Amino acid sequence: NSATMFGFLVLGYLLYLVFGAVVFSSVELPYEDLLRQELRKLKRRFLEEHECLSEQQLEQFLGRVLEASNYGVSVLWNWDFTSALFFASTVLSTTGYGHTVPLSDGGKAFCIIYSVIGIPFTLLFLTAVVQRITVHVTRRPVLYFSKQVVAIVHAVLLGFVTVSCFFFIPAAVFSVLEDDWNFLESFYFCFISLSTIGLGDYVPGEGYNQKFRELYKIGITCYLLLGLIAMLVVLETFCELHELKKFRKMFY
């Protein structure tokens, strides 16, 4: 019966993500179309309006252009559902790249509530997904039980596995998928993504003329999601070695 509990948690979470991905999609998308216009309109009017404008005339155009940039809309789509799903997930995993921020007040507010509920929901979700994976991946230090040393080797080995399997493999996959991204950049991106730092200087699936982008988003959303679980799995496996519980306990 415990299997249908975790099985439902996993289901409901995914839905909560689609739910939000939809609510965000709709409320925030409209303000974008209208903002896309105010920019395309202010773009045309600037060039055609005052060809040789002065220092005071440029700071006024650039201002309105940069302001649009900070909100995810560049003068040169953010809230579809494939991308709004991307946002909803990175907001509950708490990465927050920012390449897409809510624009209205409803979005901003819905985001807040959606999170108060989702963030926690997300912990529970992860806790379960990890407790389980942790055991199946760390039930083997026993098939080996000397005892303490089977773990210190299981850990360091498991680290070198996922570090490669989740950073280097995708660090390369992105060096591929994303043009302007070299390896370091792709790798660097993975680190700040799976760490949930999310500076947002780099975000995949945002290149001029990207084909099948809809999926790339859904793929990323999963890369990030799984990679996080993987980290936590590796974290538990490390946080549970004798020497660590020792070092930790040393401060309470």
Residue 136: closest CA among 158, 169, 156: 158
How far apart, in whole angstroms, are the C-alpha atoms of residue 91 and residue 63?
28
Residue 100: closest CA among 143, 132, 70, 64: 70
- Whole-Å CA distances, 1 to 6, 8, 122, 135, 231: 9, 11, 22, 19, 28
Number of CB atoms found within 10 A of residue 249's CB: 8
156 binds ligand CCCCCCCCCCC (CB under 6 A): no
210 binds its own copies (CB under 8 A): no
195 binds ligand CCCCCCCCCCC (CB under 6 A): yes
Residue number, 69 or 82, with CB nearest to its own copies: 69
Residue whose tokens read 């252009």: 65
127 binds its own copies (CB under 8 A): yes
How far apart, in whole angstroms, are the C-alpha atoms of residue 225 and residue 14?
11
196 binds ligand CCCCCCCCCCC (CB under 6 A): yes
165 binds its own copies (CB under 8 A): no
Query: Angle 81-92/105-137 helices, nearest 10 degrees?
Result: 70
Residue number, 78 or 93, with CB nearest to ligand CCCCCCCCCCC: 93
Residue number, 222 or 235, with CB nearest to ligand CCCCCCCCCCC: 235
How far apart, in whole angstroms, are the C-alpha atoms of residue 238 and residue 128?
18
Choose the one of ligand CCCCCCCCCCC, K ion, its own copies, none that binds residue 209, judging by a C-beta under 5 to 8 angstroms depending on kind.
Answer: none
Query: Angle 55-69/2-49 helices, nearest 10 degrees?
Result: 170
One of 94, 115, 175, 210 touching K ion (CB under 5 A): 94
Q: Show contacts with ligand CCCCCCCCCCC in window 92-131 (CB under 6 A).
A: 116, 119
Min dist CB 78 to ligand CCCCCCCCCCC, Å, is 25
Extract the tokens encoding 37.
Answer: 């216009």
One of 132, 147, 242, 245 touching its own copies (CB under 8 A): 132
6 binds its own copies (CB under 8 A): yes
12 binds its own copies (CB under 8 A): no
198 binds K ion (CB under 5 A): yes
Task: Give the binding site for ligand CCCCCCCCCCC (CB under 6 A).
Answer: 116, 119, 195-196, 231, 235
